[PDB]
Amino acid sequence: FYVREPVNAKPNWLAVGLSVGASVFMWIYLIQTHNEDVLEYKRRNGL
Amino acid sequence: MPSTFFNLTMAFSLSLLGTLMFRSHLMSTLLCLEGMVLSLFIMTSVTSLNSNSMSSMPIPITILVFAACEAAVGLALLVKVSNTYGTDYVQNLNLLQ
Amino acid sequence: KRFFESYHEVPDGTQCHRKTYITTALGGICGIIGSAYSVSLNPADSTLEAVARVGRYTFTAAAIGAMFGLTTCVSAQVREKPDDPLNYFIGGCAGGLTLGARTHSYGTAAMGCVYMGTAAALFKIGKLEGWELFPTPKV
Amino acid sequence: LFQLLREHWVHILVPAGFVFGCYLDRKDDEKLTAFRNKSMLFQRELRPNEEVTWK
Amino acid sequence: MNGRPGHEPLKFLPDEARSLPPPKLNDPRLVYMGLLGYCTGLMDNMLRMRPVMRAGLHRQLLFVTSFVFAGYFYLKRQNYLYAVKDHDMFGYIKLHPEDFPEKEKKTYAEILEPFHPVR
Amino acid sequence: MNPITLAIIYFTIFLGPVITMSSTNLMLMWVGLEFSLLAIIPMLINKKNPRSTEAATKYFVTQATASMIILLAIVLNYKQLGTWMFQQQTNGLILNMTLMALSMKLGLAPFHFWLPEVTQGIPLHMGLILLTWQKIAPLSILIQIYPLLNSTIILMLAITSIFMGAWGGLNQTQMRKIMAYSSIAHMGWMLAILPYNPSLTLLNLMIYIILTAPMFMALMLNNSMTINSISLLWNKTPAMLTMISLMLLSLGGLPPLTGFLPKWIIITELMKNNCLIMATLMAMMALLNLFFYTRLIYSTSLTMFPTNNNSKMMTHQTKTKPNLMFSTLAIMSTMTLPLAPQLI
Amino acid sequence: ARPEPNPVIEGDLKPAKHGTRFFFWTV
Amino acid sequence: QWQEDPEPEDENVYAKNPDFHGYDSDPVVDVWNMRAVFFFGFSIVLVFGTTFVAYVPDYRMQEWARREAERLVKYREVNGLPIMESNYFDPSKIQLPEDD
Amino acid sequence: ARQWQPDIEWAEQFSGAVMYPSKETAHWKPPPWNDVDI
Amino acid sequence: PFLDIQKKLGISLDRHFMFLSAEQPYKNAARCHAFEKEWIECAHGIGGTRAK
Amino acid sequence: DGPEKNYEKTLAILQIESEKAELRLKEQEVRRLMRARGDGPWYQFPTPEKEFIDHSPKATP
Amino acid sequence: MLKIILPSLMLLPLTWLSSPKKTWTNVTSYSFLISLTSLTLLWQTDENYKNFSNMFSSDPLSTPLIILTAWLLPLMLMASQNHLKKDNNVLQKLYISMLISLQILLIMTFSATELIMFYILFEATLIPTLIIITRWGNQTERLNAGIYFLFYTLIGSIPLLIALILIQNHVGTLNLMILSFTTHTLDASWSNNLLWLACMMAFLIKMPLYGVHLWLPKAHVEAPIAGSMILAAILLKLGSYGMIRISIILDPLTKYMAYPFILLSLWGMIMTSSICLRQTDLKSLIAYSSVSHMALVIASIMIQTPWSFMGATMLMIAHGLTSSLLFCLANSNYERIHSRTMIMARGLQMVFPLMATWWLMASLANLALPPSINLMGELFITMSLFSWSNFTIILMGINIIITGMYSMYMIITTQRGKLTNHMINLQPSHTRELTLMALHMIPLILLTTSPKLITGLT
Numbered sequence A: 001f002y003v004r005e006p007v008n009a010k011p012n013w014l015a016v017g018l019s020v021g022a023s024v025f026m027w028i029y030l031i032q033t034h035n036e037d038v039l040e041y042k043r044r045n046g047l
Numbered sequence B: 001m002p003s004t005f006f007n008l009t010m011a012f013s014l015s016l017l018g019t020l021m022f023r024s025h026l027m028s029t030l031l032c033l034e035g036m037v038l039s040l041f042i043m044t045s046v047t048s049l050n051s052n053s054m055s056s057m058p059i060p061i062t063i064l065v066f067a068a069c070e071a072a073v074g075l076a077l078l079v080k081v082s083n084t085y086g087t088d089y090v091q092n093l094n095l096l097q
Numbered sequence C: 001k002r003f004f005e006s007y008h009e010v011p012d013g014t015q016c017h018r019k020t021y022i023t024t025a026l027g028g029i030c031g032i033i034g035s036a037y038s039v040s041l042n043p044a045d046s047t048l049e050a051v052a053r054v055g056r057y058t059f060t061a062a063a064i065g066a067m068f069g070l071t072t073c074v075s076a077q078v079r080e081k082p083d084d085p086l087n088y089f090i091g092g093c094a095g096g097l098t099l100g101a102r103t104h105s106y107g108t109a110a111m112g113c114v115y116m117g118t119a120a121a122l123f124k125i126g127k128l129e130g131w132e133l134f135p136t137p138k139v
Numbered sequence D: 001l002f003q004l005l006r007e008h009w010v011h012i013l014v015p016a017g018f019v020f021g022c023y024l025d026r027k028d029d030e031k032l033t034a035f036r037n038k039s040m041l042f043q044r045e046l047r048p049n050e051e052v053t054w055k
Numbered sequence E: 001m002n003g004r005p006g007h008e009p010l011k012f013l014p015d016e017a018r019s020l021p022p023p024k025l026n027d028p029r030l031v032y033m034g035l036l037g038y039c040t041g042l043m044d045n046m047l048r049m050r051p052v053m054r055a056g057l058h059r060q061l062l063f064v065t066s067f068v069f070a071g072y073f074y075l076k077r078q079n080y081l082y083a084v085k086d087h088d089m090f091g092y093i094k095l096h097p098e099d100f101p102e103k104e105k106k107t108y109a110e111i112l113e114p115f116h117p118v119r
Numbered sequence F: 001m002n003p004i005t006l007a008i009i010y011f012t013i014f015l016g017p018v019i020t021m022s023s024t025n026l027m028l029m030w031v032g033l034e035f036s037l038l039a040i041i042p043m044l045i046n047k048k049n050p051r052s053t054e055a056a057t058k059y060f061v062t063q064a065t066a067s068m069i070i071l072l073a074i075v076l077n078y079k080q081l082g083t084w085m086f087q088q089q090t091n092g093l094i095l096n097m098t099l100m101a102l103s104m105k106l107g108l109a110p111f112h113f114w115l116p117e118v119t120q121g122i123p124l125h126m127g128l129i130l131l132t133w134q135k136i137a138p139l140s141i142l143i144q145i146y147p148l149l150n151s152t153i154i155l156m157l158a159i160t161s162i163f164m165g166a167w168g169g170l171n172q173t174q175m176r177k178i179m180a181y182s183s184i185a186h187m188g189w190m191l192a193i194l195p196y197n198p199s200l201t202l203l204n205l206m207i208y209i210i211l212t213a214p215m216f217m218a219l220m221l222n223n224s225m226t227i228n229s230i231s232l233l234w235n236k237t238p239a240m241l242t243m244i245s246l247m248l249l250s251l252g253g254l255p256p257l258t259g260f261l262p263k264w265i266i267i268t269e270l271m272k273n274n275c276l277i278m279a280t281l282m283a284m285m286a287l288l289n290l291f292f293y294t295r296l297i298y299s300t301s302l303t304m305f306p307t308n309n310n311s312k313m314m315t316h317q318t319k320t321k322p323n324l325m326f327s328t329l330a331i332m333s334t335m336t337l338p339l340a341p342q343l344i
Numbered sequence G: 001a002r003p004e005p006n007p008v009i010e011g012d013l014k015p016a017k018h019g020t021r022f023f024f025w026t027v
Numbered sequence H: 001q002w003q004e005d006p007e008p009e010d011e012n013v014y015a016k017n018p019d020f021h022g023y024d025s026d027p028v029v030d031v032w033n034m035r036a037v038f039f040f041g042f043s044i045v046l047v048f049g050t051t052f053v054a055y056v057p058d059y060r061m062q063e064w065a066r067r068e069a070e071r072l073v074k075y076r077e078v079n080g081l082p083i084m085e086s087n088y089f090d091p092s093k094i095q096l097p098e099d100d
Numbered sequence I: 001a002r003q004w005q006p007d008i009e010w011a012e013q014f015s016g017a018v019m020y021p022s023k024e025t026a027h028w029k030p031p032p033w034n035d036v037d038i
Numbered sequence J: 001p002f003l004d005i006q007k008k009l010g011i012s013l014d015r016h017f018m019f020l021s022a023e024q025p026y027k028n029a030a031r032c033h034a035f036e037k038e039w040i041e042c043a044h045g046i047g048g049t050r051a052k
Numbered sequence K: 001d002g003p004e005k006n007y008e009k010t011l012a013i014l015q016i017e018s019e020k021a022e023l024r025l026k027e028q029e030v031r032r033l034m035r036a037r038g039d040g041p042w043y044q045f046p047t048p049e050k051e052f053i054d055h056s057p058k059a060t061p
Numbered sequence L: 001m002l003k004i005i006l007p008s009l010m011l012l013p014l015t016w017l018s019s020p021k022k023t024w025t026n027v028t029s030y031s032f033l034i035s036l037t038s039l040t041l042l043w044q045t046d047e048n049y050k051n052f053s054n055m056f057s058s059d060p061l062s063t064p065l066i067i068l069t070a071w072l073l074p075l076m077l078m079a080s081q082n083h084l085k086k087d088n089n090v091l092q093k094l095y096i097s098m099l100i101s102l103q104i105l106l107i108m109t110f111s112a113t114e115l116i117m118f119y120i121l122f123e124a125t126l127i128p129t130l131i132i133i134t135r136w137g138n139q140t141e142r143l144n145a146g147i148y149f150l151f152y153t154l155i156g157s158i159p160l161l162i163a164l165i166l167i168q169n170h171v172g173t174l175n176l177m178i179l180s181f182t183t184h185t186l187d188a189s190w191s192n193n194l195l196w197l198a199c200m201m202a203f204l205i206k207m208p209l210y211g212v213h214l215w216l217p218k219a220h221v222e223a224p225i226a227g228s229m230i231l232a233a234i235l236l237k238l239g240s241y242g243m244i245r246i247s248i249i250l251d252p253l254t255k256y257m258a259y260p261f262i263l264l265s266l267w268g269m270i271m272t273s274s275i276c277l278r279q280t281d282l283k284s285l286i287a288y289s290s291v292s293h294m295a296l297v298i299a300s301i302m303i304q305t306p307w308s309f310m311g312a313t314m315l316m317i318a319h320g321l322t323s324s325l326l327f328c329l330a331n332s333n334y335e336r337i338h339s340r341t342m343i344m345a346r347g348l349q350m351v352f353p354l355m356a357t358w359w360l361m362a363s364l365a366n367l368a369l370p371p372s373i374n375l376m377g378e379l380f381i382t383m384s385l386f387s388w389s390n391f392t393i394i395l396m397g398i399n400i401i402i403t404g405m406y407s408m409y410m411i412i413t414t415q416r417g418k419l420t421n422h423m424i425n426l427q428p429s430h431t432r433e434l435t436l437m438a439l440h441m442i443p444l445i446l447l448t449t450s451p452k453l454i455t456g457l458t
């Protein structure tokens, strides 16, 4: 332990959920953008 | 008009030479600085007036409103200086060397 | 300004008088400017002292202008080869030497000679190869 | 299998680089495959049941 | 450039950039941005004096996944900008054809470059 | 500061550059410059130490006269063209005065003397705002007047700043003074390519901002305004010693790090435009800048300077976590040369 | 009469030729 | 005086670990840091490497050219052609500047 | 036997308000650490 | 300009009054309203390099 | 795999590098032309909006 | 060539992730194998050089080096396990990584198609080297040495940067392949006469020429053994590799723009060789030996005759291996003696029997004993130099006599004579010290059997 306890000893569970959850929103938008993109590219051009 | 504009412009340069050649008290400078704003205000107003460009008259005044505060800041610095040295001479402002 | 330019118009090694005069002026002009910055900042103690410094710098610079002009022109004269960086180098070589003397230092003459001469030589090459300085944007 | 404590976790780092390396160097070929067989000195005609000269 | 016809005054990537192929998510560059990111994360842990690799495993992810996210959408654009540059460049070469005529060099047989011997 | 005042000022210091950039009516560009002048002066004297009042009174006079000169250019234009904005036709002297006045605001080269003195005697945090955020508003005016400004004037302004900035750095040991002398040189590279490739002007700025902002938050992490002070970094916080090393060598142009790109593409653009005279001399004395950067490297990292006994006490109490962005821009600086094609 | 408007480069974008042609970036 | 440590002596690592191989102080690391260095150093680089380098075939074509010469010298001599004609690029192909 | 770490004297030079102090340039003594003058 | 937050937002706080031919109060045309118009409808679509 | 692979790979590398080189030079010529000509989409410097002209009676000729 | 490189990068993760006790063996064992993968590039069964991919290529000139660059990392990490074994477990993993990055960077520089890729990687190698010399340098003067090593290279470097960007505008690509198959013939103007100097000067500086070589004696003196090995074996040769690939362009000027350097080098060869004759610091003498034997190389990369270039490639690889061997054994004496002085430590063979055999073979490699690639190299440069002007044998003839004298003096006053009475008793030789040597010479014996591989492009 510590005479002056750490401010970080037990996790700031908000900081996990907006850090984890934010990243999983990034991917699901990113991967979506790509496949969506690929299509737009294919149809906009010949295929 | 061209002759008058020449005089006003040189007035601004004579005021320019003034603010770029200090001598003792700062309040002189700030005062000179203001001499330019008057010359700019007069020239802006003059051409706007003989171009009948009324859409631009707002500017001659915006120039003064901004210049007044600008000077307000300048004088508060000046008062701050003759509170820390009490003599307001550009001469003692050299600690930063 | 049509003046200074004249230096270049006449073939090098010819009409040294004009060359030396022009070169002397440029140096002197630089002298004035240099003294001015030297007096504006790092001011003097008395007006006279500063007038002197202006003079010193002006003359020294005028001298390094003259010898450069004279040496380069004559070197070309005597050597008979008008287009040769070496002429100028000898000139720059000399110019540096004058600076060295005015500053009463053999060492300065050393760096002065090499650095100054090299620079002048490059000017000759620059003119010979049509190098462009401060060029307009042509992208 | 990836025994830990630097048991196979680490020992397999460099080796793996090699494989990845070879995976790229054989992929670079795939890109630079124009003139596949269109070069003059080596322009043979495809032998029966052979897809391409050099892969 | 700007002033170019149709310029979108404040847009990131005009829809015209749809026509271009999307950046492969594993494009070496986006993968670099990923590593660039992981390192930012690791560096942070270090400057803040935390176990370097065993800490902030959530942050590690935010970093590797923020940088990468940024990449795809940036590269997507920079890719467009470069593509506009050709559209623009190639077009001009034609619209003003005379200025960029197609030279026709001579087979070496004809040209006679001088030979400096080493001896 | 009554938090309300803090907001009003900070808003102005931020509305100041933004109005400049957004507007086209030059007048509105001038007042954007004016608001920046008014907002920065209060923060500069926050300690209100005797050095500070000197700083602000200089900064203000230098800023004010330049502001008046910029206004005169706009006033003159108004009579040479009814427009309130510079045009192809603009008299050359009109643009030259504008060029001199804004360089005065940026402290680019001949007026470089005010920037080191003003930077000394103001807190490091405000110093960062002064060197980076304040600088963007003047250059935005210049990027707009890119085609009009004359090539010879800024080329010499640029060469002068490289020379003065480098020389100033070797003699100065005051860390904040050193930060100012690099910004004068970096500003010289930015204007050198201004009449040529503005995109590169901007790039040479962002990279300077992404380099200087981490460097200063490093200087303050331990609030060291002395090299001797930054040299004991090894005891106060050892990790930042590695990146402080690379960021400073990045600030100078050494090739593996991100800092080479701005110099490299500026040189490529100047040679494309044929200034192989000017570009060469700039690159050469640019090398002088690295000498003073590496001299600091020596003191802070490559060699361990002796420390006082009380330093053990500061190690004991928990250290202030450096900012989240210090880490991201530290890797963004020093490690993005492989991403150079997309940056330009 | 006003001056003719300058021509309009026309067509559709195609991935840049050989990509970024920065020194040594096969990209 | 400014506080600083007294000169550290260099240990005779050969006093303990009398089998010291020069790599590390504790004995097992040393043994396993030479059993892997002589091996990967000598046993499979100087040996397997030299084996492979020795078997690189006709390096830079100099094994091919000593035959191609032999059939060219065989062919040129029997057909009576000069063994190394004196112009290589045929004169007919060349279009010499006509005037000069 | 010890890579030479810098002693006090090597450190001394870096003090002073200017690294290369010339005539009438050594007069300058370092600015107060607190950034406040007497 | 450098950051066109005005065109984007569609607002026109700074463009309505940049030239002498802009809307003058009470429709009091200024001197030259005729020319500047003829100058700037000419140089519209033609860039500066060719507005010069 | 063979002599064939490097020979054909090296020719492909040269074609990409030759074509990149010709284009880089043509850029510099096109960019010289549009700057001075001002007849191309690049280097089209702005002049004030025609949009804000007041085309009205204005109680004056 | 990404197996010689990617697996290399991965070394860095291994030096960091691995256990403090096992960090040394994982790194040294793995890079020995990294060298084995490097040997695959030697399989050239045809003249067509190997263009692995757009940016990465390996031709006869680079291949003999890439293998040496990969080979020394193992050795460098074996020669610095002693000093650097007194560190904190995070200073080591930094030194090991620094050494690893040098060959990653050097492997790429020697295996780079675009000349500016050479420049960026070329001048990057200074960062790792300056850290190795300054951070771990024993003497008070390494701060100074580091400055000299950074400025002499840097002031030369920016002219090359301007020159290469210049040719890219003049020709349109810095790709060594194309630049070779394209017509770039300088026109003997005054300006070109400057271009040529701009391109060659940066390479001539790190290849110590007589005029600018003061950086190398100062740098190797205080540099740690691993840094001194890298500077002599791979770092200096970066300058030679550059001169071979850059003079493909600037073809006409070097015919007459070389005289200045050629004479600077051959007279330089004599004076640098001679001052070796009375220099008290052994590391000092090896460094000037390195300047003289590298002055021969700049005098063969400028005469430009097939044999010169072939002699140069032979000597550079050979002298690289020999110099390190000499710098490595100098360190073994330095660590037990604790002083660089040559006069102390006399008679070692009496107490270190084998190290003396390694000393003898290293010296015979240093001087030109004939069944050695070292001699073949000099014999060839000597021949061409003679062709350039029959008089050259006089100056390249005073160097051979002097080279014999200092090479044997190092053996005679360090490894013979009566033993020093009682210096700190000299502990016996470690097996690492001896292998680090054996690893240098066994390859020197094997390469001498088949010189064709290091024969150059010509």
Ligand SMILES: CCCCCCCCCCCCCCCCCC(=O)OC[C@H](COP(=O)(O)OCCN)OC(=O)CCCCCCCCCCCCCCCCC
Residues within 6 Å of the ligand: E046, F238, F239, F241, F242, F245, F246, F256, F301, F302, L012, L090, L094, L097, L098, L101, L104, L105, L124, L127, L128, L131, L135
């Ligand atoms: C192009 C390559 C250029 C050269 C790259 C390699 C050199 C980079 C420049 C290094 C500059 C600084 C050199 C001196 C640094 C001294 C650092 C030091 O003394 O260590 C203490 C520091 C903090 O310690 P801590 O991690 O908290 O744990 C121990 C607590 N005492 O712990 C540390 O600082 C050491 C660990 C730092 C983080 C790891 C960095 C390791 C080096 C990674 C090199 C990657 C090279 C990649 C090359 C690619 C080439 C294409």
Ligand SMILES: CCCCCCCCCCCCCCCCCC(=O)OC[C@H](COP(=O)(O)OCCN)OC(=O)CCCCCCCCCCCCCCCCC
Residues within 6 Å of the ligand: H045, H046, H049, H050, H053, H054, L035, L039, L042, L063, L064, L065, L067, L068, L071, L317, L361, L364, L365, L369, L371, L372, L443, L444, L445, L446, L447, L448, L449, L450, L451, L452, L453, L454
């Ligand atoms: C590669 C570039 C440089 C790299 C340097 C560092 C590399 C280290 C890692 C790799 C080490 C192994 C690779 C390098 C050695 C290659 C050995 C080799 O190539 O042997 C070839 C030889 C076959 O002979 P070959 O030349 O093919 O036949 C000629 C036909 N006209 O096959 C053999 O005969 C093998 C014979 C083994 C034992 C030979 C001993 C002979 C000694 C003769 C000289 C003795 C006196 C030497 C005096 C030296 C004085 C210093």
